[PDB]
Amino acid sequence: YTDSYYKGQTALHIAIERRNMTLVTLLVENGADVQAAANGDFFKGFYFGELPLSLAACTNQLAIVKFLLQNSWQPADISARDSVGNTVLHALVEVADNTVDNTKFVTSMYNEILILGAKLHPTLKLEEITNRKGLTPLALAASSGKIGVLAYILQREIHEPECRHLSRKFTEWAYGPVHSSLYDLSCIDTCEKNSVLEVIAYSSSETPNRHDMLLVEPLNRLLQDKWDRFVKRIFYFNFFVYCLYMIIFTAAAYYRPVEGLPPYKLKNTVGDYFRVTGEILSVSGGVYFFFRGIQYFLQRRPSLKSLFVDSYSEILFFVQSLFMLVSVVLYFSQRKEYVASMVFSLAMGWTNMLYYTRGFQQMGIYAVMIEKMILRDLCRFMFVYLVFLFGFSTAVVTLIESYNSLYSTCLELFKFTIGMGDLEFTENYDFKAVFIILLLAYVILTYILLLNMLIALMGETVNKIAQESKNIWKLQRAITILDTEKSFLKCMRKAFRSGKLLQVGFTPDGKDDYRWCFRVDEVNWTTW
């Protein structure tokens, strides 16, 4: 019994796996070691925690955990950490897969484990234990997308004495049908190591339900309050600054001189001075955006795949900055091709003006719809339409013989999609029937069918991504809020939440429980 497929597993593990309770006691009373962690590669098969206690807990055998934790024979270490370091709570967070029954099971098992740990060790905060990756169970749930466990923890309410301090949702004055809940923000806004909001907003883009998690009551209200308190003013100021900068860029570029020698001497004139000032401002903004892109690439450390997956705004801004920098280089390199670069950072730049629509609910949802449509439907349609257009342009140009060039024929065929095809644009075909048949078939296939098909696909898509688009907009707002909070450039400390409140003031040690609670009112009209 030395192979890795069933390595480490002992008689106690087999007894726990068989749902047998008397046999487990018979084994334990003999002297069985409950700390013989199973380090087999089969138990990273399925990975339950690599300990008999975690194995019992994750299989819904609460009785076995109850016996092991407080057995009179050999103590069971609730805080035991395996090779990966994931303790019992981390194992429960990992095993859960958001299923309703599994969600209820993990919620109940986590609650019972926490209660028992407090009972044995009232002075120990079990949930604060960190694995080898430095992620707390709440943080681990946030990273892995365990929405059910996240919702339970953020709404963990326990009324029993000696177990209240483990909760986060604490009731307040509730004389009548209106009650205010204090949601604990401990490590939900800033844990100083890694907060829930940071993990959710700065995820790796592969989390199954990164969008939905922010719908959790406390998190959604916290982010909305942050937006409505101070972030709104700063974001609108940034929007205005961007508009001013881009109008400056448009004025400077539009009034560029037509003369040669791209490096133009600064003639003594007020208008020329204004143009030079505008160019300097535009280049400074481009350098700032380039440095912003570099900073975001270095800090967030994208996985080399999230760049094109969930970070388009930063990518577009960085590419516009690259275009500006290449334009400046060509301007100082005696190359008149700088226009070809400059003009690309102008038009594209105005498109990025859609990035400042994240702050407005309707316009942000519109931008999210634009993103999704371009990603899926516009991409598929462009694939198929390019196939058809290249095929029929090649056919026509082979049949045609000034329009014998492939480029001209492709342009003429594309003009049919914008409803401008001549249908008789040439007379060199020499086979009128064949050319006419080709053009007619192309028109019916692409203009009549493919475009209307794109319309229908987009209608069906918007009919099925409404709430998804709203969730993505809220996620974008969360990302912007966190970026402003971490980087603000105004020397302000208004990122703090509702003042510290005396939750209970009677900790298990008798000390005072002070936590950065957040207050949410609500009204209940039934029986109260």
Ligand X SMILES: NN1C(=O)C(=O)N=NC1=S
363 binds, among a copy of itself, ligand X, none (CB under 5 to 8 A by kind): a copy of itself
Instruction: Tell me phi and psi for residue 519, to 5 degrees.
Output: -100, 125
Residue 218 or 262 with smaller CB distance to ligand X: 262
Cβ-based burial of 247 (10 A; exposed 0-12, middle 13-18, buried ≥19): exposed
| Residue 464 among known ligand-binding residues | no
Q: Is 423 in the site for a copy of itself (CB under 8 A)?
A: yes
Nearest residue by C-beta to ligand X? 401
Q: Is 516 in the site for a copy of itself (CB under 8 A)?
A: yes
Rounded distance between C-alpha atoms, residue 387 and residue 344, angstroms: 27
Residue 230 or 385 with smaller CB distance to a copy of itself: 385
Of residues 99, 108, 303, 361, which one binds a copy of itself by CB under 8 A? 99
Contact criterion met (CB below 8 Å) for 428 and 401: yes
Q: Is 236 in the site for a copy of itself (CB under 8 A)?
A: no
* Residue list 39-98, contact with a copy of itself (CB under 8 A): 45-46, 48, 59-60, 97
| Residue 66 among known ligand-binding residues | no
Of 98-106, 177-185, 197-205, 425-433, the window that binds ligand X (rule: CB under 6 A) is 425-433
Of 128-136, 157-165, 393-401, 464-472, the window that binds ligand X (rule: CB under 6 A) is 393-401
Contact criterion met (CB below 8 Å) for 150 and 141: yes
- Least distance from C-beta 343 to ligand X, angstroms? 8
Contact criterion met (CB below 8 Å) for 126 and 89: yes
Contact criterion met (CB below 8 Å) for 372 and 364: no
Rounded distance between C-alpha atoms, residue 458 and residue 380, angstroms: 12
* Strand ranges (E), 248-303: none
* Residue list 326-365, contact with ligand X (CB under 6 A): 336, 339
Residue 276 or 363 with smaller CB distance to a copy of itself: 363
Of residues 322, 370, 399, 462, which one binds ligand X by CB under 6 A? 399
243 binds, among a copy of itself, ligand X, none (CB under 5 to 8 A by kind): none
| Residue 421 among known ligand-binding residues | no
Contacts of 419 (CB under 8 A, 6+ apart): 447
| Residue 183 among known ligand-binding residues | no
Q: Is 430 in the site for ligand X (CB under 6 A)?
A: yes
Kindly state the number of chain residues that form the binding site for a copy of itself, as judged by CB under 8 A. 151
Nearest to 483 by CA among 287, 223, 288: 223
Rounded distance between C-alpha atoms, residue 138 and residue 152, angstroms: 10
Side chain identity at 365, as an amino acid letter?
I
Rounded distance between C-alpha atoms, residue 5 and residue 3, angstroms: 6
Of 68-76, 142-150, 209-217, 423-431, the window that binds a copy of itself (rule: CB under 8 A) is 423-431
Contact criterion met (CB below 8 Å) for 323 and 293: no
Structure tokens at 149: 């466990």
Q: Is 433 in the site for ligand X (CB under 6 A)?
A: no
| Residue 512 among known ligand-binding residues | no
| Residue 424 among known ligand-binding residues | no
Q: Is 406 in the site for ligand X (CB under 6 A)?
A: no
Q: How many CB atoms lie within 10 A of CB 128?
A: 10
Long-range contacts of 18-27 (CB under 8 A, 24+ apart): 19/59, 19/61, 21/63, 21/64, 21/67, 24/64, 24/67, 25/67
Residue 264 or 297 with smaller CB distance to a copy of itself: 264
x/- mask, ligand X, residues 252-291, rule CB under 6 A, reads: ------x---------------------------------
* Residue list 314-343, contact with a copy of itself (CB under 8 A): 337, 339-340, 342-343
Rounded distance between C-alpha atoms, residue 37 and residue 27, angstroms: 16
Contact criterion met (CB below 8 Å) for 214 and 191: no
| Residue 351 among known ligand-binding residues | yes
Rounded distance between C-alpha atoms, residue 373 and residue 292, angstroms: 28
Contact criterion met (CB below 8 Å) for 164 and 507: no
Of 34-42, 350-358, 387-395, 428-436, the window that binds ligand X (rule: CB under 6 A) is 428-436
Of 101-109, 137-145, 273-281, 298-306, the window that binds a copy of itself (rule: CB under 8 A) is 101-109
Q: Is 10 in the site for a copy of itself (CB under 8 A)?
A: no
Rounded distance between C-alpha atoms, residue 221 and residue 521, angstroms: 11
Of residues 431, 496, 514, 528, which one binds ligand X by CB under 6 A? 431
Rounded distance between C-alpha atoms, residue 445 and residue 449, angstroms: 5
| Residue 6 among known ligand-binding residues | yes
**Residue numbering of the annotated binding site for Ca(2+):** 422
**Residue numbering of the annotated binding site:** 6-9, 17-18, 312-313, 351, 358, 419, 422
**Residue numbering of the annotated binding site for ATP:** 6-9, 17-18
Q: Which residues bind ligand X (CB under 6 A)?
A: 258, 336, 339, 399-401, 428, 430-431
